[PDB]
Amino acid sequence: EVLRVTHELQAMKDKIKENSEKIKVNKTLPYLVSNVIELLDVKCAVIKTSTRQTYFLPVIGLVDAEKLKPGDLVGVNKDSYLILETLPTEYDSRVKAMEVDERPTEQYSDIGGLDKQIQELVEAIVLPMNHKEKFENLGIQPPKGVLMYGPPGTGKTLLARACAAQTKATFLKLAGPQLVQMFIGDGAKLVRDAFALAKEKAPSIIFIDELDAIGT
Amino acid sequence: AXXXXXXXXXX
Amino acid sequence: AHHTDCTFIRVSGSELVQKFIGEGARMVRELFVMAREHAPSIIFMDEIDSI
Amino acid sequence: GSELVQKYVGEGARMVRELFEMARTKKACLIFFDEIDAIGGARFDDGAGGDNEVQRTMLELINQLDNIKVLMATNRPDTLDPALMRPGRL
Amino acid sequence: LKELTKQYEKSENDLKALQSVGQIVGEVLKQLTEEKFIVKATNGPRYVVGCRRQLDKSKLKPGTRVALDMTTLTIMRYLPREVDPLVYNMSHEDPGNVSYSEIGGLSEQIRELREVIELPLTNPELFQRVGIIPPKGCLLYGPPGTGKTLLARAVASQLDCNFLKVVSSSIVDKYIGESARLIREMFNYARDHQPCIIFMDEIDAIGGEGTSADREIQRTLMELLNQMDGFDTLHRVKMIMATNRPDTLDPALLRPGRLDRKIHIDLPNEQARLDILKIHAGPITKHGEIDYEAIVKLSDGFNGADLRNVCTEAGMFAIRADHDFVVQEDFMKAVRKVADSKK
Amino acid sequence: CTKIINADSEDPKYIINVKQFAKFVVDLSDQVAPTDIEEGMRVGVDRN
Amino acid sequence: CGKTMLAKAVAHHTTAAFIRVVGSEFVQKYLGEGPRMVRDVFRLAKENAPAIIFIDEIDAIATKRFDAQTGADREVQRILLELLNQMDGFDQNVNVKVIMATNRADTLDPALLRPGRLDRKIEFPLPDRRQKRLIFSTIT
Ligand SMILES: Nc1ncnc2c1ncn2[C@@H]1O[C@H](COP(=O)(O)OP(=O)(O)OP(=O)(O)O)[C@@H](O)[C@H]1O
Ligand SMILES: Nc1ncnc2c1ncn2[C@@H]1O[C@H](COP(=O)(O)OP(=O)(O)O)[C@@H](O)[C@H]1O
Numbered sequence: 099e100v101l102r103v104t105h106e107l108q109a110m111k112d113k114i115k116e117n118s119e120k121i122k123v124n125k126t127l128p129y130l131v132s133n134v135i136e137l138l139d140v141k142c143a144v145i146k147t148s149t150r151q152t153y154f155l156p157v158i159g160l161v162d163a164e165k166l167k168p169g170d171l172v173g174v175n176k177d178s179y180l181i182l183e184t185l186p187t188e189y190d191s192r193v194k195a196m197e198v199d200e201r202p203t204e205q206y207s208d209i210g211g212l213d214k215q216i217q218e219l220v221e222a223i224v225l226p227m228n229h230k231e232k233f234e235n236l237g238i239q240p241p242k243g244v245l246m247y248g249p250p251g252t253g254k255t256l257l258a259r260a261c262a263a264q265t266k267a268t269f270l271k272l273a274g275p276q277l278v279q280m281f282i283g284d285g286a287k288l289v290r291d292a293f294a295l296a297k298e299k300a301p302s303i304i305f306i307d308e309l310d311a312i313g314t
Numbered sequence: 315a316x317x318x319x320x321x322x323x324x325x
Numbered sequence: 326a327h328h329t330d331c332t333f334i335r336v337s338g339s340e341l342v343q344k345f346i347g348e349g350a351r352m353v354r355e356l357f358v359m360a361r362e363h364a365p366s367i368i369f370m371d372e373i374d375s376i
Numbered sequence: 377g378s379e380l381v382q383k384y385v386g387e388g389a390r391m392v393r394e395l396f397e398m399a400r401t402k403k404a405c406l407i408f409f410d411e412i413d414a415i416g417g418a419r420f421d422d423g424a425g426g427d428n429e430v431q432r433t434m435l436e437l438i439n440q441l442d443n444i445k446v447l448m449a450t451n452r453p454d455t456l457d458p459a460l461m462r463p464g465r466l
Numbered sequence: 467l468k469e470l471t472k473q474y475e476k477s478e479n480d481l482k483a484l485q486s487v488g489q490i491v492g493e494v495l496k497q498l499t500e501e502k503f504i505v506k507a508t509n510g511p512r513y514v515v516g517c518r519r520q521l522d523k524s525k526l527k528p529g530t531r532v533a534l535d536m537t538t539l540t541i542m543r544y545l546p547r548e549v550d551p552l553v554y555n556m557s558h559e560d561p562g563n564v565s566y567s568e569i570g571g572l573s574e575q576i577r578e579l580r581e582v583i584e585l586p587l588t589n590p591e592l593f594q595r596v597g598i599i600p601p602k603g604c605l606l607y608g609p610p611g612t613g614k615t616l617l618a619r620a621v622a623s624q625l626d627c628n629f630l631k632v633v634s635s636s637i638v639d640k641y642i643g644e645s646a647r648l649i650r651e652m653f654n655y656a657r658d659h660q661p662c663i664i665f666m667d668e669i670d671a672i673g674g675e676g677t678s679a680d681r682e683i684q685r686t687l688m689e690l691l692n693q694m695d696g697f698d699t700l701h702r703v704k705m706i707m708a709t710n711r712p713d714t715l716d717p718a719l720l721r722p723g724r725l726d727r728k729i730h731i732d733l734p735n736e737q738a739r740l741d742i743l744k745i746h747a748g749p750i751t752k753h754g755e756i757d758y759e760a761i762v763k764l765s766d767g768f769n770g771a772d773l774r775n776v777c778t779e780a781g782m783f784a785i786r787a788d789h790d791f792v793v794q795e796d797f798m799k800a801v802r803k804v805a806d807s808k809k
Numbered sequence: 810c811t812k813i814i815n816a817d818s819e820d821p822k823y824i825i826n827v828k829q830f831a832k833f834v835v836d837l838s839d840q841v842a843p844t845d846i847e848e849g850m851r852v853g854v855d856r857n
Numbered sequence: 858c859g860k861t862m863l864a865k866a867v868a869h870h871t872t873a874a875f876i877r878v879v880g881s882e883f884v885q886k887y888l889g890e891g892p893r894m895v896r897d898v899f900r901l902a903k904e905n906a907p908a909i910i911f912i913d914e915i916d917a918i919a920t921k922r923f924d925a926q927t928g929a930d931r932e933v934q935r936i937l938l939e940l941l942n943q944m945d946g947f948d949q950n951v952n953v954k955v956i957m958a959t960n961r962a963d964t965l966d967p968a969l970l971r972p973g974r975l976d977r978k979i980e981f982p983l984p985d986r987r988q989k990r991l992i993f994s995t996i997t
């Protein structure tokens with residue numbers, strides 16, 4: 099009977115191989131990189147192609163539905179618009195480039211006169227990030243953000259580095275002006291990724307200067 | 315004061 | 326307009342005042358072109374205080 | 377000044393980068409933005425229109441500015457963005 | 467063989483999947499007959515299409531999304547309305563869950579605002595039983611920072627009804643007719659999402675003369691007034707327009723069905739300072755006893771918004787000192803910090 | 810070329826931007842060398 | 858005093874195509890969007906005729922034309938004139954009645970009160986000791 103089970107496995111191996119070969123010759127290339135917009139339930143998703151056309155997919159395709167999530171950038175067939183393969187993000191290369199590790203060392207000895215401003219951000223950053231254990235017991239939620247408003251020439255980008263440098267952290271500076279790209283759905287991707295690139299790394303600060311560029 | 319405004323069209 | 330035997334065009338009030346700049350000038354350009362290829366013509370602009 | 381304001385969105389900024397990029401490649405490059413008022417108007421929310429297209433071309437120039445020396449001429453300086461006249465760019 | 471089977475069966479579905487084609491997602495916009503519609507692709511021409519036999523003729527009403535076949539151009543199935551945070555309207559701004567109890571010292575005022583706002587939305591029978599149209603609108607006037615918004619925010623949290631917050635002063639933009647338009651989009655937005663407490667912030671700006679711009683304020687009031695007692699639809703949404711200056715507000719705005727109830731919310735009630743601190747103090751760990759009474763007189767005329775800071779600012783004092791608040795000595799200076807530094 | 814997936818370091822599967830057309834995950838024709846197409850450099854593709 | 862109510866009614870009681878438009882709805886920004894709204898209202902009513910167009914709170918866009926000296930009073934005047942030109946102008950419309958309601962009645966431009974555009978200037982005076990009785994008997 100051991101031989102009989104082996105025969106069933108041998109047959110299965112050929113059919114698994116044959117199905118794999120048909121999928122292999124139907125994977126092919128190139129893939130239209132689309133952006134899953136949502137997932138209606140009633141195994142079918144609404145792909146919004148990069149060509150600026152939406153295409154509901156009756157079957158999500160050669161992927162596991164549970165893996166696909168609203169926002170995933172999958173590779174789909176240019177004609178059928180069936181999701182072929184999930185495309186890895188890796189936070190592109192630009193996104194990781196905005197992780198400058200050369201904070202110019204704007205040591206608080208280098209920023210002057212803005213002390214109460216200096217100590218205040220150390221209360222809402224640095225302190226909240228560094229000594230979070232006490233922050234957790236107190237119940238005092240540390241405000242995740244701080245907007246830097248004031249007449250130009252006050253040095254907002256400067257104390258920002260000060261909290262950036264003399265407080266460690268990663269400091270993914272994402273100045274708003276850069277987040278204006280004529281390529282549809284790029285800065286937004288740069289945004290979600292930036293926080294995505296942000297989650298990967300250890301305690302850091304996502305700094306966006308000139309927020310008017312997208313703050314309009 | 316109250317300012318009426320024209321507009322262009324980025325193609 | 327009831328006795329004219331001449332194409333009687335009617336531009337009245339704010340019909341030449343278009344939001345996009347350089348479009349108001351265009352319409353009047355095409356209005357005096359449709360009034361020449363169809364001449365003799367009479368452009369009747371009512372409420373000229375508007376424009 | 378004229379070429380930096382293109383019909384298609386973004387092509388103004390794409391030109392600003394492709395000019396400054398063409399400078400860093402050269403050694404001892406001078407850029408002379410005559411009549412900065414064309415693409416250096418004081419910012420204001422007018423997103424309901426193509427004007428912000430020009431403004432985002434300046435913000436792509438403000439980022440760019442702040443061996444490359446830059447000159448600018450403006451018979452009417454008062455119409456320039458306060459940001460672009462600060463002593464960190466000009 | 468068992469492991470091979472479950473993967474192989476999934477693979478077989480994938481082989482069918484490679485065969486399946488895409489449907490051009492689109493929206494219907496008219497129904498010429500029982501077999502013809504005018505569907506528009508999301509970024510596409512408007513094709514005249516029919517509906518698959520196994521479809522509900524009805525369910526496809528104007529606005530009903532469909533995913534027509536890519537060659538036949540015949541609709542093959544309805545779809546839910548697209549949901550994206552593309553909304554420009556605060557409406558999604560959840561109030562967040564705030565119990566009435568959390569606002570402190572406004573028992574009477576909170577009780578009143580419950581009446582006009584809560585009642586028409588929850589038990590309409592009472593109003594229709596007596597035969598009076600449900601009251602709509604509450605005007606909450608009081609010193610700034612007293613917490614007019616919170617009470618208006620808790621009312622949304624209890625009813626679980628969408629809340630739209632408009633900073634009224636912002637709506638009055640310089641270009642002509644923008645100011646009326648923002649108000650118009652607000653009420654027009656409400657028709658789509660019901661029921662929503664339209665909380666207008668300081669309303670003195672729009673309600674309460676010879677210049678072009680001196681009549682734009684006049685026009686915007688007329689747009690606000692019309693959208694309330696206005697032909698279109700009377701609606702079931704409620705407005706909580708709160709001001710800081712009630713003398714300024716125009717008479718028409720204070721009427722039975724056009725914004726009634728002048729609920730006054732003065733600086734935190736004498737006893738409230740306790741309750742407010744009670745509701746805002748306890749959260750932060752603080753084993754040490756509290757002489758709250760002195761803090762009360764240490765904090766006279768306090769805006770209440772200041773009181774929220776009092777405890778929080780004390781927490782920063784504690785964030786330095788050590789990690790546990792064990793002394794009222796903290797609130798004293800915290801009271802000062804939330805006074806001289808809050809001036 | 811906006812990215813280099815480098816699927817196995819032997820089948821790179823480059824992603825290319827056609828400017829206005831779309832973003833595609835393409836693979837090299839045999840003529841080009843895998844090492845000649847560095848990330849970000851302008852790359853010529855075939856219409857098909 | 859009940860002006861709009863008679864209009865809300867005529868709508869429930871009309872076989873035409875009621876088209877309500879409040880006065881401030883024409884004051885749209887982007888010069889050439891306000892005046893065009895007038896030219897779209899009378900075009901919509903002309904196609905779906907006969908119709909009633911009810912411009913409530915007409916005091917916003919029809920105040921006596923005092924010579925404009927800024928680009929704002931000029932665009933409020935471009936609206937009134939576009940209003941005047943479609944009501945009684947070279948393009949006479951068939952079966953398009955216009956109902957207008959205002960709370961002032963004297964600030965209105967003399968051209969928009971000239972027997973031909975707004976023919977019947979009905980007045981709604983404060984209820985006397987009699988209309989108050991009828992008013993009470995219907996609300997209660
Ligand atoms: N407190 C300070 N001490 C020393 N230099 C300062 C201080 N504040 C600003 N500066 C200097 O002002 C210049 C402007 O830099 P920075 O970008 O920080 O200014 P800013 O006010 O943030 O500009 P903007 O607000 O327009 O973005 C720099 O040379 C910076 O070092
Ligand atoms: N009397 C109060 N009771 C409770 N919280 C208050 C009070 N006054 C201010 N607050 C706090 O301040 C905020 C609400 O203030 P807000 O409603 O905006 O004031 P106003 O509308 O009077 O200017 C919330 O964070 C709330 O916790």
Ligand SMILES: Nc1ncnc2c1ncn2[C@@H]1O[C@H](COP(=O)(O)OP(=O)(O)O)[C@@H](O)[C@H]1O
Nearest residue numbers: 695858859860861862913914958960992995996
């Ligand atoms: N004669 C009336 N009969 C019934 N209700 C009336 C009467 N007069 C006034 N009302 C009440 O007042 C409203 C009248 O609207 P009104 O203020 O005159 O509108 P507008 O100022 O826009 O012309 C009605 O909705 C109704 O509630």
Ligand SMILES: [Mg+2]
Nearest residue numbers: 254255307308
């Ligand atoms: Mg800066």
Ligand SMILES: [Mg+2]
Nearest residue numbers: 860861862913
């Ligand atoms: Mg009315």
